[PDB]
Ligand binder design. Structure first.
Ligand SMILES: CN1c2c(O)nc(N)nc2NC[C@@H]1CNc1ccc(C(=O)N[C@@H](CCC(=O)O)C(=O)O)cc1
Lengths: 304, 304
C-alpha cells in the first residue's frame, strides 16, 4: 500500500490510478508508429482504414474479455498526418487517446488544427510534457483546454530514480515538469519516468513507487522500445520474445504501477493475457492490504 | 530487504536463499509426473532414457545460458518406478533433486531402497514434510540421513500468511513442521507455503515474505499447480499460454521468492527466459540498495 492518498482520474470513463488492486491496469497500444505497415504515406497520413478499424475493434474485444481499459497511443511524423490520425480515432473508437510525436512541433501543430473542442478536452491526453518543453507548447495546451498530460521524466541527465523525481517536482532554479504542466492548465498528471533499457525498468519502477508514495499521481512506463532493442532475446523468436516482453511489461504492475504503454497494438492479444493475470493475483491480495476494488470490471472476476 | 539474516544453503553447488538480488532464482522442473508421455508404464517405471537425457541436457544448456541453477522434481506413482527414476537422475546429471509423490508410502518405500548413500544425503531433498507427516516418514528420513527438505507450510486451517508462523513453529499442543523436520535430522528447510490456484499465488507470496522477514528460511512455491489446469489459457495455444504462465511464474520472484517449481521440464525453454528477465531487473536494483550479488553467474551479467 502507498503512503499518499492516491489520485484516481476519470478519463471519459477510464479510471486510472489508486492503491494496488483497486483498479485494473490501463493498457496503451501504439498505432501509426514509425514502420507501421498499415501506413503507405507517413507524411500525408495515408493508411488502411479497415486494418486500423480492425486493431481498434480487437482492443475493444480484449478489453471486454479481461476488464483492462485501453487508451490509444496516436503517433505522427507530420502535422498533416497526426491531424488525420486523430480525426480517424475520434470517429472510429470512443476510447481516450494520447497525442504523440518525437517532434514537439508536430504535436503543437496538430493540437492547433483541433482548436477548442469539448470531445478533444475529454478524450485527448498530451504525450508529453518533457525536459525540452517551451512556453509556446504550454500556451498551445492551455488554448486547447486540455486537462490530462503524460509527464515524461526520461532524461540522460537524470538516470537515478531521485533525479527523475527532481525533474518532476523541480530543484534549485528549475520549476519541474509538474509546475510546467499546471501553468498549461493541466490538472491530471500521468507520470512516466522513462525506460532507458530493460535492466533499469526496476529504476523506472522505483521512480513510479516514489511518485505514488509522496504525490499519489498515477505512475506508468513504456518499455516496448527497450524490449525491441534487446537483440539477444528478440533473435530467439516466438514464444521466447513474448514471455521476456511479458516479464518486462508485468514487472511495474507487480510494484503497484497503474498503466503500461505496451508498444504496437498488434501485440495486444498476448499483452492483455499477461497483464490481466498479474492484475488478478494483486486484487486477490486486497484483504491483506485493506484495499477495496473500485469496479467489478476487473480481471480477477473475468479471466477464470 | 528482509530484517532476519537470510539462510543461504549450498546444495551440491546450488545456492538457495539470500536477500532479493543476491542470488538468481533456483528453477525446479518436474519429470515423470502423471501423464508425462516419456513414461509408458508408471507402475514398473518404463520410460524413454534418450528423451529423459535430452530434457536434463536442455536444463543444463538453459542454466548455462541464463545463470539460473536447477533442482529436478522427480515424481513417481510406485516404489519400483521412483527408485529407477532416482538411479537415472543420479547417473545422468549433477543437479540436486526433489524425491516426490502424491503417495507418502511411495516416498518412504523409495527412500528405503536408496539407503544412507553419501550422494543421496548431498543431492536428495525430501518433498515434503507436510501437515499430516507420520513417525514412519520421519524415521525413513532419519535412516536415509537426509539434511535438506521442502517444508510444505500449507493447511486449509492456515490460509492467512501469518498462520504459517503457527505451522512452522507449532502452536498449543501441535509440534511445528520445523521441530518435526529436526527430529528427522533435517538441518536445511526450503519453505513452500502452498498454491491452491492462480489468484491465491499472491497469498503464497505474502507467506514467503513473512517466513523470510522473521526466520530467514529460503521461500518458494509451485504455481504450476494452477496454470496447466487453466484450460481457458492453455487451449489458446502459443504464445497466449506461455505469457500467462510467465506472469504467474515470475510474480513470486517480484516479491522476493528464492525458488519456483515451474511444472513439466518441456516448458524450460520459455520459463528460463521469463524468470532470467525478472532476476536481471531485480539485481539491477542492487545498484541503489547496496545489496551485493553473491555470484557472477547471474542473469543480469549474462542475458544482455
Ligand atoms: C503439487 N506440487 C507441488 C507443490 O505444490 N509443492 C511442492 N513442494 N512440490 C510439489 N510437487 C508436485 C507439484 C508441482 N509439480 C507439478 C505440478 C503440476 C503438473 C501438472 O499440471 N501436470 C499436468 C499434466 C502435464 C500437462 O499436460 O501439463 C496435470 O494436469 O496433471 C506437473 C507437476
Amino acid at each position: 500500500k502507498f503512503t499518499a492518498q492516491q489520485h484516481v482520474y476519470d478519463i471519459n470513463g477510464v479510471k486510472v490510478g489508486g492503491q494496488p488492486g483497486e483498479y485494473p491496469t490501463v493498457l496503451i497500444g501504439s498505432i501509426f508508429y514509425r514502420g507501421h505497415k498499415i501506413v503507405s504515406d507517413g507524411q500525408k497520413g495515408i493508411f488502411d482504414k479497415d486494418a486500423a478499424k480492425a486493431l481498434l475493434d480487437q482492443e475493444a474485444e480484449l478489453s471486454a474479455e479481461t476488464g483492462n481499459p485501453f487508451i490509444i497511443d496516436v503517433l505522427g511524423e507530420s502535422v498533416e498526418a497526426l491531424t488525420k490520425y486523430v480525426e480517424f480515432i475520434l470517429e472510429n473508437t470512443t476510447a481516450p487517446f494520447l497525442l504523440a510525436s518525437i517532434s514537439p512541433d508536430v504535436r503543437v501543430g496538430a493540437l492547433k488544427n483541433l482548436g477548442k473542442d469539448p470531445e478533444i478536452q475529454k478524450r485527448l491526453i498530451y504525450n508529453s510534457i518533457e525536459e525540452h518543453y517551451t512556453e509556446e507548447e504550454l500556451a498551445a495546451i492551455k488554448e486547447a483546454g486540455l486537462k490530462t498530460a503524460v509527464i515524461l521524466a526520461f532524461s540522460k541527465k537524470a538516470l537515478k530514480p531521485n533525479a527523475r523525481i527532481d525533474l518532476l517536482q523541480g530543484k534549485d532554479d528549475k520549476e519541474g515538469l509538474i509546475a510546467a504542466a499546471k501553468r498549461a492548465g493541466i490538472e491530471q498528471f500521468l507520470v512516466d519516468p522513462g525506460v532507458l533499457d530493460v535492466a533499469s525498468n526496476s529504476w523506472t519502477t522505483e521512480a513510479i513507487n516514489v511518485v505514488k508514495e509522496q504525490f499519489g499521481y498515477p505512475g506508468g512506463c513504456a518499455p516496448s522500445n527497450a524490449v525491441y532493442l534487446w537483440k539477444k532475446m528478440r533473435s530467439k523468436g516466438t514464444p521466447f520474445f513474448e514471455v521476456a516482453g511479458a516479464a518486462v511489461f508485468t514487472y511495474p504492475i507487480t510494484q503497484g504501477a497503474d498503466f503500461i504503454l505496451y508498444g504496437p497494438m498488434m501485440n495486444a492479444p498476448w499483452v492483455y493475457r499477461a497483464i490481466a493475470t498479474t492484475d488478478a493475483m494483486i486484487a486477490y491480495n486486497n484483504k491483506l492490504t485493506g484495499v477495496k476494488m473500485g469496479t467489478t470490471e476487473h480481471p480477477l472476476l473475468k479471466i477464470f
